[PDB]
Every structure is written in C-alpha cells, then in structure tokens.
Amino acid sequence: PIEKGKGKAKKGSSFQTVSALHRENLNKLMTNLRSTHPHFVRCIIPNETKSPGVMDNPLVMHQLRCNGVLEGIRICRKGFPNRILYGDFRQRYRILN
Amino acid sequence: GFTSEEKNSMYKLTGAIMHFGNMKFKLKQREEQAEPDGTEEADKSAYLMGLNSADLLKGLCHPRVKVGNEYVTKGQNVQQVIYATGALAKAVYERMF
C-alpha cells in the first residue's frame, strides 16, 4: 500500500474502500442520466390491502400532490415543450405547398 | 462536357461559402450560449445542400459530443459556435476544390 508516485495509492485500487468504489459508480451513473433525453411514466398504488379491483381515492390524492403530478400537468399546459428550428419548414414542405 | 444538372450543382455547393458568414450570433449573457438571430442566413446554405434543415439549425449549436467513447450533449458558448460555423464554410471549400 503506497502513498507516492503520483504521490498516492495505485495498486489494488487507490485507497478506495467499498464506499469509494460505489461512489465512483454513483457519479458516472447520475452524470450519464443527465447526458440523455428522459421520458417518464408515473404509476399509482390503488390500496394497501393488495386488493385488485378496489381503489381508494384519499390514497391517490395524497400521492398526486406530493409527487407534484398537478404541477407537471400545469407546466405541460403552460409551456412550449419543443425548442426546434425554422428551416425545417421550407425544405420538407416544398412538396406539400 | 458537364451535365445540365452538374452546371447548377457545382455552383450550388460553391456559393454557400458566401452564404455562411451571415449567421449573426448575439450575446445573451445568462450563460453565454448564443443561438444566432435568424434563419435565412443558414437556409440559403441548407437548400443549396439539401441537408436536413432541422439537423442543421439544431446540431450547429447542440451536437452529440464523443466523450472518450460514449455520447454526451452540450450547447456551445457564443464565440465557440461563431468561429465553428466559419470553420464549416472553409471546410466545404478546401474539400470542393
């Protein structure tokens, strides 16, 4: 176990415990999720009795607002979701009109 | 002994190198990632090429960056793009001649 030559640790790992190994993964993973264009699904539990067919609505309500489902529905309406470009028209729609 | 097409074709590719210099990026200091104020400037380029007009006007500012071997995205800061577009027209000319 060394402290020098790039004055640090080198063989085996560095001085990287299990936490450091996992943290290295935890970094790349999170950074790489940011590297992409996400699309989401949000799913709701019906009742806590593991019962099919039945649904409780207090249970939905409590889930909805805390996950900000309303705000998502509110921003999708208010916003302008796709910031694209002009030239896209003139070329492709010469065929059209 | 040029074909009747190729007459216009060589002029098409050659003339864009005048057109490209028009793309006037403008400072919007909230990050410095400028997007150019117009479309006609780069459309007169696009049409003469028949490259995907959407691919053009988007990709110029936000391209897929090869990072090591994987893929990330980025907006280019103002001057980075301004010069990088000027690179494009001179890139066509070296190749065309």
Coordinates of C-alpha atoms in Angstrom, one line a residue:
Chain A
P1 CA 0.0 0.0 0.0
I2 CA 1.7 3.1 -1.4
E3 CA 1.5 6.9 -0.9
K4 CA 3.8 8.0 -3.7
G5 CA 4.3 8.1 -7.5
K6 CA 1.6 10.3 -8.5
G7 CA 2.1 10.7 -4.7
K8 CA -0.9 8.5 -3.8
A9 CA -2.2 4.9 -3.9
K10 CA -2.1 2.9 -7.1
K11 CA -2.1 -0.9 -6.9
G12 CA -5.2 -2.9 -6.0
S13 CA -7.4 0.2 -6.1
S14 CA -6.2 3.5 -4.8
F15 CA -7.0 3.9 -1.1
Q16 CA -10.6 3.3 -2.2
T17 CA -12.9 1.5 0.2
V18 CA -16.2 -0.1 -0.9
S19 CA -17.9 3.3 -0.4
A20 CA -15.4 4.9 -2.8
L21 CA -15.9 2.2 -5.4
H22 CA -19.7 2.5 -5.2
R23 CA -19.4 6.4 -5.2
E24 CA -17.4 6.2 -8.4
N25 CA -20.3 4.3 -10.0
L26 CA -22.8 6.6 -8.3
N27 CA -21.1 9.6 -10.1
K28 CA -20.9 8.3 -13.6
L29 CA -24.4 6.9 -13.5
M30 CA -26.1 10.1 -12.4
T31 CA -24.0 12.2 -14.8
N32 CA -25.0 9.9 -17.6
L33 CA -28.7 10.2 -16.9
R34 CA -28.2 13.9 -17.4
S35 CA -26.5 13.1 -20.7
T36 CA -29.8 11.9 -22.2
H37 CA -33.4 12.9 -23.1
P38 CA -35.7 11.3 -20.5
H39 CA -39.3 10.4 -20.9
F40 CA -41.3 9.3 -17.8
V41 CA -44.0 7.0 -16.5
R42 CA -45.7 7.8 -13.2
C43 CA -47.7 4.9 -11.6
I44 CA -50.2 4.9 -8.7
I45 CA -50.9 2.4 -6.0
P46 CA -54.7 1.7 -5.6
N47 CA -54.9 0.5 -2.0
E48 CA -52.6 -1.0 0.6
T49 CA -54.6 -4.2 1.1
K50 CA -53.0 -5.8 -2.0
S51 CA -56.6 -5.9 -3.3
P52 CA -57.3 -5.9 -7.1
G53 CA -60.5 -4.2 -8.4
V54 CA -60.7 -1.8 -5.4
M55 CA -59.3 1.7 -5.4
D56 CA -59.2 4.3 -2.5
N57 CA -59.2 7.9 -3.6
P58 CA -57.6 9.6 -0.5
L59 CA -54.7 7.4 -1.3
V60 CA -54.5 8.8 -4.8
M61 CA -54.8 12.4 -3.7
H62 CA -52.0 12.1 -1.2
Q63 CA -49.8 10.6 -3.9
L64 CA -50.7 13.2 -6.5
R65 CA -49.8 16.5 -4.9
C66 CA -46.7 15.2 -3.0
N67 CA -45.2 13.9 -6.3
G68 CA -46.4 17.2 -7.9
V69 CA -48.4 15.5 -10.5
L70 CA -50.7 18.5 -10.8
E71 CA -47.7 20.9 -11.4
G72 CA -46.5 18.6 -14.2
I73 CA -49.9 18.7 -15.8
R74 CA -49.8 22.5 -15.1
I75 CA -46.5 23.1 -16.7
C76 CA -47.2 20.9 -19.8
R77 CA -50.2 23.1 -20.5
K78 CA -48.5 26.4 -19.8
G79 CA -45.1 25.7 -21.5
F80 CA -43.9 25.3 -25.1
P81 CA -42.2 21.8 -24.9
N82 CA -40.0 21.5 -28.1
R83 CA -37.5 24.3 -28.9
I84 CA -36.8 23.4 -32.6
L85 CA -35.8 25.4 -35.7
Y86 CA -37.3 27.3 -38.7
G87 CA -35.6 26.0 -41.9
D88 CA -37.2 22.6 -41.2
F89 CA -40.4 24.0 -42.8
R90 CA -39.2 25.5 -46.2
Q91 CA -37.3 22.4 -47.2
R92 CA -39.6 19.5 -46.3
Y93 CA -42.9 21.3 -47.1
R94 CA -42.0 22.4 -50.6
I95 CA -43.5 19.0 -51.5
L96 CA -46.7 19.9 -49.6
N97 CA -47.3 23.5 -50.6
Chain B
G1 CA -18.9 18.1 -71.2
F2 CA -20.7 18.8 -67.9
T3 CA -24.3 17.6 -67.5
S4 CA -27.1 20.1 -67.4
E5 CA -27.6 19.2 -63.7
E6 CA -23.9 19.5 -62.7
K7 CA -23.8 23.0 -64.1
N8 CA -26.1 24.2 -61.3
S9 CA -24.7 21.6 -58.8
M10 CA -21.1 22.8 -58.7
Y11 CA -22.4 26.4 -58.3
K12 CA -24.8 25.3 -55.6
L13 CA -22.0 23.8 -53.5
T14 CA -19.6 26.7 -54.3
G15 CA -22.0 29.6 -53.5
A16 CA -22.9 28.6 -49.9
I17 CA -19.4 29.7 -48.8
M18 CA -20.7 33.2 -49.3
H19 CA -24.0 32.5 -47.5
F20 CA -22.5 31.1 -44.3
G21 CA -20.9 34.3 -43.0
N22 CA -24.3 35.8 -42.5
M23 CA -25.2 33.7 -39.3
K24 CA -25.0 36.5 -36.7
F25 CA -24.7 35.1 -33.2
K26 CA -25.7 37.6 -30.5
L27 CA -24.6 37.8 -26.8
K28 CA -27.4 36.8 -24.4
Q29 CA -25.4 36.8 -21.2
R30 CA -27.1 34.3 -19.0
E31 CA -24.6 31.5 -19.7
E32 CA -23.1 33.0 -23.0
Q33 CA -24.6 30.1 -25.1
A34 CA -25.7 32.1 -28.1
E35 CA -28.1 31.0 -30.7
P36 CA -27.9 33.1 -34.0
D37 CA -30.6 35.7 -34.7
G38 CA -32.3 34.5 -37.9
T39 CA -32.6 31.5 -40.3
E40 CA -32.4 32.9 -43.8
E41 CA -28.6 33.2 -43.4
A42 CA -28.3 29.4 -42.9
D43 CA -31.3 28.4 -45.1
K44 CA -29.6 29.8 -48.2
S45 CA -26.8 27.4 -47.2
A46 CA -29.1 24.4 -46.3
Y47 CA -31.2 24.4 -49.5
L48 CA -28.2 24.5 -51.8
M49 CA -27.0 21.4 -49.9
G50 CA -30.3 19.5 -49.2
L51 CA -29.2 18.6 -45.7
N52 CA -31.9 18.0 -43.1
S53 CA -32.9 21.6 -42.2
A54 CA -33.7 20.6 -38.6
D55 CA -30.4 18.8 -38.3
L56 CA -28.6 21.9 -39.4
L57 CA -30.2 24.7 -37.3
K58 CA -30.2 22.5 -34.2
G59 CA -26.9 20.5 -34.5
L60 CA -24.8 23.6 -35.1
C61 CA -25.3 24.7 -31.5
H62 CA -26.1 21.4 -29.8
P63 CA -24.1 18.4 -31.2
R64 CA -23.6 14.9 -29.7
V65 CA -20.1 15.0 -28.1
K66 CA -17.9 11.9 -28.2
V67 CA -16.7 11.7 -24.6
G68 CA -13.9 9.0 -24.5
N69 CA -16.2 6.6 -26.5
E70 CA -19.7 7.4 -25.2
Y71 CA -22.1 10.2 -26.1
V72 CA -23.0 13.5 -24.2
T73 CA -24.6 16.8 -25.4
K74 CA -23.6 20.5 -25.0
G75 CA -24.5 24.0 -26.0
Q76 CA -21.5 25.8 -27.4
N77 CA -20.7 29.2 -25.9
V78 CA -21.2 32.2 -28.3
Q79 CA -17.7 32.6 -29.8
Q80 CA -17.2 28.8 -29.9
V81 CA -20.1 28.5 -32.3
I82 CA -19.5 31.7 -34.3
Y83 CA -15.9 30.5 -35.3
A84 CA -17.1 26.9 -35.6
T85 CA -19.6 28.0 -38.3
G86 CA -17.0 30.0 -40.1
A87 CA -15.0 26.7 -40.0
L88 CA -17.8 25.0 -41.8
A89 CA -17.8 27.1 -45.0
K90 CA -14.0 27.0 -45.3
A91 CA -14.3 23.2 -44.6
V92 CA -16.5 22.9 -47.7
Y93 CA -14.1 24.9 -49.9
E94 CA -10.9 23.0 -49.1
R95 CA -12.8 19.8 -49.9
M96 CA -14.6 21.1 -53.0
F97 CA -11.5 22.4 -54.8

